């Protein structure tokens, strides 16, 4: 889904698999905060949500615990209790159109 209608999915009771998160080289914008970037298997907070959108280009950097802008004024906003963080991807011909 797009940014204007951002979709969320709650992860139910299951054993968290975070080992392949850091060993994957496909992640190049894991500039994110919160808990320590090593003890992910030692934390099992009660509920976890994953929210997805397709914002473009350099607008991703405005996602921060407290920020304003054309994206972070009338769209997804980050509070000061945002435990967890953000993973970004890279665009290609998979999401593209010549026309």
């Amino acid at each position: 889904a797009s940014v204007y209608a951002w979709n969320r999915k709650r992860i139910s009771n299951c054993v968290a698999d975070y080992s392949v998160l850091y060993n994957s080289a496909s992640f190049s914008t894991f500039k994110c905060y919160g808990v320590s970037p090593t003890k992910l298997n030692d934390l099992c907070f009660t509920n976890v949500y994953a929210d997805s959108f397709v914002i473009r280009g350099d607008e991703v950097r405005q996602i921060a615990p407290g920020q304003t802008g054309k994206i972070a004024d009338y769209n997804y906003k980050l509070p000061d209790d945002f435990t967890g963080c953000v993973i970004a991807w890279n665009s290609n011909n998979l999401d593209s159109k010549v026309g």
Partner: single-chain antibody
Amino acid sequence: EVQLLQSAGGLVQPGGSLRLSCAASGFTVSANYMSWVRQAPGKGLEWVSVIYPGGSTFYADSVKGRFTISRDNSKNTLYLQMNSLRVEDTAVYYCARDLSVAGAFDIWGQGTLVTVSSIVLTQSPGTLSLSPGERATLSCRASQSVSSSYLAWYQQKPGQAPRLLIYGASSRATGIPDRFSGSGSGTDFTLTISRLEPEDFAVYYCQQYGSSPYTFGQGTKLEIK
């Protein structure tokens, strides 16, 4: 009949304080964007600040912190405070509503002048002196190669306020007649004026938006051989 009035024609002592004023004539300032542009006579135009609905303000890269802009909905004003100012600050301080995506700077203010104590976007052609009776081509190049529709065109006037010609290089603004056309993509955008009229000889600028702080061209003048 929208009108944007300004009144700031006053001399400033070294390290003085001044308060500009921009008003509104029918549209509320609490639901539309406002922006300030420095004319910089003898050079192309620049950018100062942008305010969104809400009231978060973004400043230019050159000037940081010292500027203090504020909005007063009770009196419907767009106040801007100049604190202790340094050298090289004498220029015009136009204020205008910003709808860059749908119409770039459709209406402007009237202009002012504040004195002092005691993106790579370029316009290629230049003066290109010609005569009425044919067309002409104006080329604007950008180094970042913005994708589709993030460049607009402006027309100046001696002593008057800048005017909008085309927004997004695809469709002209309201009141713009069919003697102006625009095309081009990738790196360069071309503008053509057909059937030159006496009320067409004016400075033409190309400006970029939808990106990092806005930049205008150096300035292209129309002259008669």
